[PDB]
Design a protein around this ligand. Structure first.
Ligand code: HEM
Ligand code: HEM
Ligand SMILES: O=[N+]([O-])c1cccc2cn[nH]c12
Ligand SMILES: O=[N+]([O-])c1cccc2cn[nH]c12
Ligand SMILES: [Zn+2]
Lengths: 400, 401
């Protein structure tokens, strides 16, 4: 009926009544759980539900304006096979999509999202202008502001606007001869696509990639981000003097650009969004994942730890100092950053706010709990319920 | 139809075909996932399936022996509502239950399990003797050996044998008149139950609780484990000289005693089992959980860390050193223990073995990934499929509730 969830640190229980409202199917069945896996009339039912959500949000549900809107969309769909959202609806929908993202621990900030309407975009060049503007606004010289820029919706019998890059700012990954990768291993494919489309590659570990922007029915076009718009942070450790010499750095702006935004049945294949970094994403995942920069052993060796035996907990010790270096460096550079303890505590507050506001909150435990020191944070001890609500952000296949 | 699971570190992909054989329903539905939540004709089909499993295991499927077995089990259930397992079947069944435990990261060891048959136990006193013998064998002076002791099965006509304690060795949790708890806060209820039943309590932080054992339809009885049978390890740190002054310690043997063992439709409400500790369970959960010993702040302060701000990562640093103290202490005392890196690496080998052997393996990601340094272990990057197979270890309601 209603999932009963317990917080094991306090013993409190709540019921996630919002889950009974889940609009789409997940991959689990009563026979087996797949929670750990990373990956016309229908349009109308989704559109109506969304319009209903919008009017409820402004406390005008059941009004003649609400009825008029419903009829307006039904008419548009009959006449064109699709419909258009009003600016206020787009803004509400984009905020709801963030609010609804089960894997995001930074949702306490959902209501403060700044939504840029780029549905008037006509070309790859105009896209670029929007992207540079988003980066300038969002970065704000270190005092980051959450934002999303929404490009034109998917339309039948017309290609999509697409940003080939996974994030607005990413480091190149160069296949070396010996099979190794110089730079970020996660970006080998996009790096090679950029080279193929005319980019002259660098040869460093932290070379900022160019953007491959695609306008409807046009091949992707290459654009170089002005270095003055890309704020970066050189990494140093507060006590380990040699850390700075490793030459490690990371960018200030985490801007996912390959996800699809769905609002009332409409799809926006290009709608880059950005907030600010939770330190573990950089320190633990980006820098320490075995398939990423994999710097753990290199750092442990510099700290002079016994890397001969697992029981010395050399990996754990190195990891903690790498995260300390990240936090210390961003704070020194005056660039917004949140540590995993502060972030998880704010998420517990978000859960409480949502229990009061909607009677629940879709949350994916495996993604909410940080990659290091999980049980040292409050979210680890909190049972969660994962489900799909729309508006939403969804994964989509790469354009190539 | 078959779940595709990927390892993100290697890139490799496998399909869990074993999952299609899931024997019972979990809590998830297509609408919502609840994986993070901690908690006659029927008998016949489960019994026949178990017998089929046993015969396949000894490569005699379809033999006359297999056929007679099925008929005998059917005859017994038809006449009595239950049946008698053979000794070899009980042994096979106990190992499969461990093998099938989704939340256990130590399953690489599933085939090496000593099974003590106690199905003819007739009293709480005899149950105590069986338990003392189990603890003795399992502890083996520090060279721990996996074991399980199986008490009489549940059956029509009488109540069940039950062990009230959650583990054979646990520390008392005393409510202080001030609302705080001395000892282990997780054990306040069982501690109070022991006192209610006749136990005059101690007043320490690490007082081994007496066993509260119950024979069918009788009030539980109290028994105190001879101290010489309970091996403990005093905690010290290899470089932090003051750590030893905290007076911390932990027991050598992790022996879960409140789960029900299910084999071929038969249920064994009392069947305590034990292996050896994965260091984080002691260092991170038992000592650092806010609702447990909660020693993080005391340690960070003695380490002279800045506990006024979360961004100094004082919590993380202290936890790492507490785990270091646990590993160092057990290694020094010559008591078996395994760190989370070694344990997760072995479980990755287990997954590989099971893929070849059964075409899959039920695994609960949230429990397999250690409480600290999750992404630093290989299991974090391995997608998993969670499902129920029988024989199995299941949770059951407390005997007083
Ligand atoms: C304000 C600061 C923010 C923080 C600290 C934050 C943090 C996070 C973290 C830690 C994850 C999990 C990534 C991982 O470790 O695997 C995540 C995922 C996600 N976040 Fe947030 N986030 C923020 C803002 C935003 C904004 C502005 C949006 C959109 C408007 C958003 C949308 C999402 C989505 C859709 C995911 C899932 C991505 C995926 O599954 O690949 N986040 N976020
Ligand atoms: C050989 C050493 C062993 C190690 C290192 C090991 C380790 C673990 C760990 C770390 C957990 C998770 C505990 C938690 O999340 O709090 C677990 C759970 C479990 N283990 Fe093992 N284990 C071992 C042996 C055994 C044996 C001998 C059995 C049974 C015959 C067993 C049965 C189980 C079961 C049923 C669970 C689930 C417990 C629950 O859900 O509360 N384990 N084990
Ligand atoms: O870890 N993060 O901070 C993070 C991860 C994924 C998306 C976004 C957007 N802002 N911050 C994010
Ligand atoms: O953490 N552990 O080592 C652990 C947890 C739960 C049950 C058993 C049995 N042996 N070791 C166990
Ligand atoms: Zn699930």
């Amino acid at each position: 009926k209603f999932p009963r969830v317990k917080n094991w640190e306090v013993g409190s229980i709540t019921y996630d009544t919002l889950s009974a409202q889940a609009q789409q199917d997940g991959p689990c069945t009563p026979r087996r759980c797949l929670g750990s896996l990373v990956f016309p009339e229908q349009l109308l039912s989704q559109a109506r539900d969304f319009i209903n959500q919008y009017y409820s949000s402004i406390k005008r549900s059941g009004s003649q304006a609400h009825e008029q809107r419903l009829q307006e969309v039904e008419a548009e769909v009959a006449a064109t096979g699709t419909y258009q959202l009003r600016e206020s609806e787009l803004v509400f929908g984009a905020k709801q999509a963030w609010r609804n993202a089960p894997r995001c621990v930074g949702r306490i900030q959902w209501g403060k999202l700044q939504v840029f309407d780029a549905r008037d975009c006509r070309s790859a060049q105009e896209m670029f202008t929007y992207i540079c503007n988003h980066i300038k606004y969002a970065t704000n010289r270190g005092n980051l502001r959450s934002a999303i820029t929404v490009f034109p919706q998917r339309c039948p019998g017309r290609g999509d606007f697409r940003i080939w890059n996974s994030q607005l700012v990413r480091y190149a990954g160069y296949r070396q001869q010996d099979g190794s990768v110089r730079g970020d291993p996660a970006n080998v494919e996009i790096t090679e696509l950029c080279i193929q489309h005319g980019w002259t590659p660098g040869n460093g570990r932290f070379d900022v990639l160019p953007l491959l922007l695609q306008a409807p029915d046009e091949p992707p076009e290459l654009f170089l981000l002005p270095p003055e718009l890309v704020l970066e942070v050189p990494l140093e450790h507060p006590t380990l003097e040699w850390f700075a010499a490793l030459g490690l750095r990371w960018y200030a702006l985490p801007a996912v650009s390959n996800m699809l935004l769905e609002i009332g049945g409409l799809e926006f294949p290009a709608a880059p969004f950005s907030g600010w970094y939770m330190s573990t994403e950089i320190g633990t995942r980006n820098l320490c994942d075995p398939h990423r920069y994999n710097i753990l052993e290199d750092v442990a060796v510099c700290m002079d730890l016994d890397t001969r035996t697992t029981s010395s907990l050399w990996k754990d010790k190195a990891a903690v100092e790498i995260n300390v270096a990240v936090l210390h460096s961003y704070q020194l550079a005056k660039v917004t950053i949140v540590d995993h303890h502060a972030a998880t505590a704010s998420f517990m507050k978000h859960l409480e706010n949502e229990q009061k506001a909607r009677g629940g909150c879709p949350a994916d435990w495996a993604w909410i709990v940080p990659p290091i020191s999980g049980s040292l944070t409050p979210v680890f001890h909190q049972e969660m319920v994962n489900y799909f609500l729309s508006p939403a952000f969804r994964y989509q296949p790469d354009p190539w």
